[PDB]
Amino acid sequence: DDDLVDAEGNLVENGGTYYLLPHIWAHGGGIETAKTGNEPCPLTVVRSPNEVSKGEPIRISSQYRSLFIPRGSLVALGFANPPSCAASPWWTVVDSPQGPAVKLSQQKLPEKDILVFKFEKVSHSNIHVYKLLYCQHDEEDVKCDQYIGIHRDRNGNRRLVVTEENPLELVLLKA
Amino acid sequence: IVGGYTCGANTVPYQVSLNSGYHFCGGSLINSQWVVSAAHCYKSGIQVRLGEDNINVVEGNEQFISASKSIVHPSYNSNTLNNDIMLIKLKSAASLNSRVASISLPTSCASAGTQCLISGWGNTKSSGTSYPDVLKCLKAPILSDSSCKSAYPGQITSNMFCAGYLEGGKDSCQGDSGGPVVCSGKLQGIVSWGSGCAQKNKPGVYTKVCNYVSWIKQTIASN
Ligand SMILES: [Ca+2]
User: Fold this and answer.
1) Chain A, chain B: beta-carbon pairs less than 8 Å apart
2) CA spacing 20 to 30 A to B176: which of A39, A112, B11, B48?
3) Domains of chain B, earliest start first
4) CB contact under 8 A, A63 and B81
């Protein structure tokens, strides 16, 4: 009677912690932070260079006060265990020399800058998998007409960025 | 409900629990065959369970009724959390007794400062997750539109209002959704959304039922 479901076939609990792994075990492991470019600490959200690493425990939250994540609800994704300098464990999307990239901020962020994601189940039904949408607000009608993808860089960091033709896929595993 | 107390068996005769195999949202009985909840609690095949206290087990006062019609507000916008209101028609009228009773719709919007009774079987702890067996209660006041918007800049429309404490400590939480907010004997609100639970400067945001009442009565009169 809902959509957001982890790997074990159990409902995704709002505010709970989950590992975000790829669909095909060849693209990388779970999600984690990384120090890329000229950052003073780990402020870049990437996929584990490892392919068997569950990554970092990630909380998935919705503004709604329901036990689960309502379909079509915008969500925020944050590290259950925040890093050093992050003033918030929540991800956000900021412009970078590379283009819009999923980063952690040193600035306290408001709901609007974090509730910009939305999971979307995939066609190949053989196990719960989802694409991650990026929804930038507009004028009291935030439109989710973009996806978040992987951009492997000069140092190998599989950083999460906004794409439109290289979307990534994820499976959720209760941390 | 964090920072609240145990209501006591059936002391909130209008508290309803929406079940889809398990409890996933509160609701409120407005008459023998129509229930009100949050739009985001929409699900197919809803079983409305009334006269409940311990939702985990049967105690002899429950009334299990399958949903016949589940009308989510036409203007519901899952993104913006706006018009988060849903109506439910029971396949069969409920037997109204002392344990199962309806709550009066508000024909007038309550003013800020009014004390309200928020009810629900949701998480009762700020950080962490601990769901109760029995109905939890909580008295909280309607906050001003300027404070509400101060807490949630750019997120408050005229169809929602805050209630609770800027200080935090007491508030609604996950699993309370769709539940009632009764003030001065009328269902002035519906547990809708909020940032965290019992957090500072982040009170509960509720669907402003008083703006929807004309719509409620109409649909009930034609469905
Ligand atoms: Ca029971």
Assistant:
1) 82
2) A112
3) 1-12+103-210 (2.40.10.10), 13-102+211-222 (2.40.10.10)
4) yes
